[PDB]
Amino acid sequence: ADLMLAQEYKGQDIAGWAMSEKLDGVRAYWDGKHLISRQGYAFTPPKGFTAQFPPYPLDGELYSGRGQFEQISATVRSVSSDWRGIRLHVFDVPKAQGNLYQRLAVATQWLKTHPNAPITIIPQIKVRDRRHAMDFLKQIEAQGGEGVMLRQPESRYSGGRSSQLLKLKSQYDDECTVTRHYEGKGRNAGRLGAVGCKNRHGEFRIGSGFKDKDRDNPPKIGTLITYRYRGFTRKGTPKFATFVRVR
């Protein structure tokens, strides 16, 4: 119903937090009877897939292995497919009592007595400091992983955006709406130095990633563009914002 949503990591201290690998699957909320997607609609898996799920809710990601998102998404969006290989990788037991580790223990005992259920408890590792998190992320991207998830253990499960569940990657990518053009200095005078962009993060400039043709023929105001970035600024806006392509 009310799905706990993750923010992006900005620089908060995470000493004592619980980190895990960020899985590139499909979000699924188990309400004790149905698998509910982020859009609020129920999935339609084969009968017997959820037959050995617990009668209480579970929040997790429908996942199989690395680099398989397209295969997963295609499999779950159908009503004539095989879900073998797809499991619900659980990252919290929404309605249980205690800290994160005590809530997950509830689902762990269910797996003990239901070993053929297609469920997996996501390992949660204790975080020392920011350097440790970057280290864990560093080796995850090496194995082909996508990033790291950081969770405040003592926190509870709440719906909506939360500062206790943060995404951590080395290179993010998003989209924004071009709002304004800014003339460049020196050898970019009379043409584009940076564009103004707008999205859920507010307004900010993008000055890098532009060819010379892009600077002579910049993207129209109101156009949706894509851009990479790593980390955020003290103002709370994308850092190292690099233009990629249009649309």
Place this chain on the structure above:
DNA sequence: CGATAG
């Protein structure tokens, strides 16, 4: 003054 993309 430093790091990045062109």
Place this chain on the structure above:
DNA sequence: CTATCG
């Protein structure tokens, strides 16, 4: 080498 942002 030259520009953007950090």
